[PDB]
């Protein structure tokens, strides 16, 4: 379970912004490995959780899950206050089977990335238009 | 039950700050000896309570307890009122037995102080990263 | 991270020293336990600290730290080093979720250096209520 400070390069509305993330420990309760943004407040920071799972006799499949939680908090007008306002969740959930090879798994991951870069999907998400 | 104005030296994020505390009376209801910070408002002041106890036939042990309650207020919210916003509790509870000597008791207290000064614990508390 | 941790200058007179090697996190509840190497399976002074995350019910961090150290007993014709008296001490903080770092550390430091002040020292060494 290796971790490191991960930089994210060319992510933004334009593609010029960069992001830095530092690791903040594996939670052994449910396998949740968290990464966070270097902030003092524990409730005003962008955070990214990732958790590979294991198959029991209940579900019998791998279940990879990635959550992203960006919370934008607005200015507090009076003097000094600061308060969280709105949330912006994000979820990714792969359901890879037992006998899958790594070629088709990487094919799914590359396909999801390239489809996130498509013009149709940024038409659907960034402007909230339905599909066309 | 002696009391005095207690100064706290080199407590802070850097270790340069000092604190002054003045005594504000033993409450005879439950043995709670309180110390406080010299403020006018009775709800915007850092306070430290300490209460040694006694053994009944119920629990049969000494039970020393120290509470610390720091509250940081926030200022104007469209009016000049200096109202309270957040609490920050702290609790310490020793459970010393009857036949304990003072060497092992002072060993526990010195151990707790030196472990509060360790780098691991300020990694865990000041940055909240789980260890 | 974890590390061998060594207490320095700690004791009744402060000349004693202590050292620990972590025994590893217990997965079930997250308790992280350090220990001081002592050969016996059970005479070891041990110290455990595990910090939670705000659950659905309460919403505020609750760092908690125990310290529990027992003691030995004499030979009874069988060498077993049995344990008699415990001496638990626990410390718990509960800062709310919006608190900044400066506030959080301040309380930690204060607790630590408060103990050195004589008022605490008489009470703890000597059980004479302040």
């Amino acid at each position, epitope marked *: 379970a290796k971790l490191e400070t991960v930089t994210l390069g060319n992510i933004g509305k334009d593609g010029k912004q960069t992001l830095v993330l530092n690791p903040r420990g594996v939670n052994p309760t449910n396998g949740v490995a968290s990464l966070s943004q270097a902030g*003092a407040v524990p409730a005003l920071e962008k955070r990214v959780t990732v958790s590979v799972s294991q198959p029991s006799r209940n579900r019998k499949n791998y279940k990879v899950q990635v959550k992203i939680q960006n919370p934008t908090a607005c200015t507090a007008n009076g003097s000094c206050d*600061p308060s969280v306002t709105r949330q912006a969740y994000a979820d990714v959930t792969f359901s890879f089977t037992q006998y899958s090879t790594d070629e088709e798994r990487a094919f799914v991951r590359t396909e999801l990335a390239a489809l996130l870069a498509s013009p149709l999907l940024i038409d659907a998400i960034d402007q909230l238009n339905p599909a066309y | 039950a002696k009391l005095e104005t207690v100064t706290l030296g080199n407590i802070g994020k850097d270790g340069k700050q000092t604190l002054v505390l003045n005594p504000r009376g033993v409450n005879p209801t439950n043995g709670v000896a309180s110390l406080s910070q010299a403020g006018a408002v009775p709800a915007l*002041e850092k306070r430290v309570t300490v209460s040694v106890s006694q053994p009944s036939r119920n629990r049969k042990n000494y039970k020393v307890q120290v509470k610390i309650q720091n509250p940081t207020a926030c200022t104007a919210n469209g009016s000049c009122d200096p109202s309270v916003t957040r609490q920050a509790y702290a609790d310490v509870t020793f459970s010393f037995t009857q036949y304990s000597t003072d060497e092992e008791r002072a060993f526990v207290r010195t151990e707790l102080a030196a472990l509060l000064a360790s780098p691991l614990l300020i990694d865990a508390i000041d940055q909240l990263n789980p260890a | 991270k974890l590390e061998t941790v060594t207490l320095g200058n700690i004791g009744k007179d402060g000349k004693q020293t202590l050292v620990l090697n972590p025994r590893g996190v217990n997965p079930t509840n997250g308790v992280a336990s350090l220990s001081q190497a002592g050969a016996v399976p059970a005479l070891e002074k041990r110290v455990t600290v595990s910090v939670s995350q705000p659950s659905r019910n309460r919403k505020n961090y609750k760092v908690q730290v125990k310290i529990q150290n027992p003691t030995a007993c004499t030979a009874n014709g069988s060498c077993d080093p049995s344990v008699t008296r415990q001496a638990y001490a626990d410390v718990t903080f509960s800062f709310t979720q919006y608190s900044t770092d400066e506030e959080r550390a301040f309380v930690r430091t204060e607790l630590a250096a408060l103990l050195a002040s004589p008022l605490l020292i008489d009470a703890i060494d000597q059980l004479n209520p302040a």
Partner: antibody, heavy 122, light 105 residues
Framework: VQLVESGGDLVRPGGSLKLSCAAS????????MSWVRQTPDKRLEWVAT????????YHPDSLKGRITISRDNAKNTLYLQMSSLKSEDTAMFYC??????????????????WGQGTSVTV | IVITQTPAILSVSPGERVSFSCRAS??????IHWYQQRTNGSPRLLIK???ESLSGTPARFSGSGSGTDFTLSINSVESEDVGDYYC?????????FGAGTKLEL
């Protein structure tokens, strides 16, 4: 201990500027600076603070949109982002330390180790 | 709070002491300071929290006062310790400083 800054151009009205100070001796992650403006005849007034982490940024109520502080912990410097300069509030700037704080409120405050000063003039 | 202080100018010989009267409009719980603006430089602390003297200050400086009217009561005016003595207050909301005071000989 040096706290030298440099942002001192002659700026047209309505414009904007950016100035920063370095710090030595003081470990920068440990503290939180604040700017203090000295009106160029005698008097003084507080500009804005920031905390130790850089999240909470405290302003005054008189000017709100004109000032934002960014804190750069990696290079021991903080940036004062000034925008929409009004006329006649051009004066020298200084950076404080937050050396000797107390009280419950954060902005109960003390100011040692002042800077050198850079003029801003319209 | 409007913090005022009464002497606009002052003159003493280098032997005689002098006090600087300051007055707060609303009560402040012993939370003011004192700064020492020299001629062509930057200020510095003299008196912390209206009574506590630092190590960087000279021992001649001394301040006192509780509740409303605060002052520093410098006991020996050593030559070329001159300038502009601003007052500052840290209660309420926006901290606001004093107007100014001269200390020529």
């Amino acid at each position: 201990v040096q706290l030298v800054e440099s942002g001192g151009d002659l700026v047209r009205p309505g414009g904007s500027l950016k100035l920063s100070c370095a710090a030595s001796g003081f470990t920068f992650s440990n503290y939180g600076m604040s700017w203090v403006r000295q009106t160029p005849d005698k008097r003084l007034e507080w500009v804005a603070t920031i905390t130790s982490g850089g999240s909470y940024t405290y302003h005054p109520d008189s000017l709100k949109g004109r000032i934002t502080i960014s804190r750069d912990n990696a290079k021991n410097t903080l940036y004062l982002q000034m925008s929409s300069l009004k006329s006649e509030d051009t004066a020298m700037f200084y950076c404080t330390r937050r050396g000797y704080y107390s009280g419950s409120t954060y902005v109960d405050y003390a100011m040692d180790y002042w800077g050198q000063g850079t003029s801003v003039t319209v | 709070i409007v913090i005022t202080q009464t002497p606009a100018i002052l003159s003493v010989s280098p032997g005689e002491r002098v006090s600087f009267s300051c007055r707060a409009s609303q009560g402040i719980g012993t939370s003011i300071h004192w700064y020492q603006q020299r001629t062509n430089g930057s200020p510095r602390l003299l008196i912390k929290y209206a009574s506590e003297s630092l190590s960087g200050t000279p021992a001649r400086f001394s301040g006192s006062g509780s509740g409303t009217d605060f002052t520093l009561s410098i006991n020996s005016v050593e030559s070329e310790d001159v300038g502009d003595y601003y007052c500052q207050q840290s209660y309420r909301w926006p901290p606001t400083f004093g107007a100014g005071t001269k200390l020529e000989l």
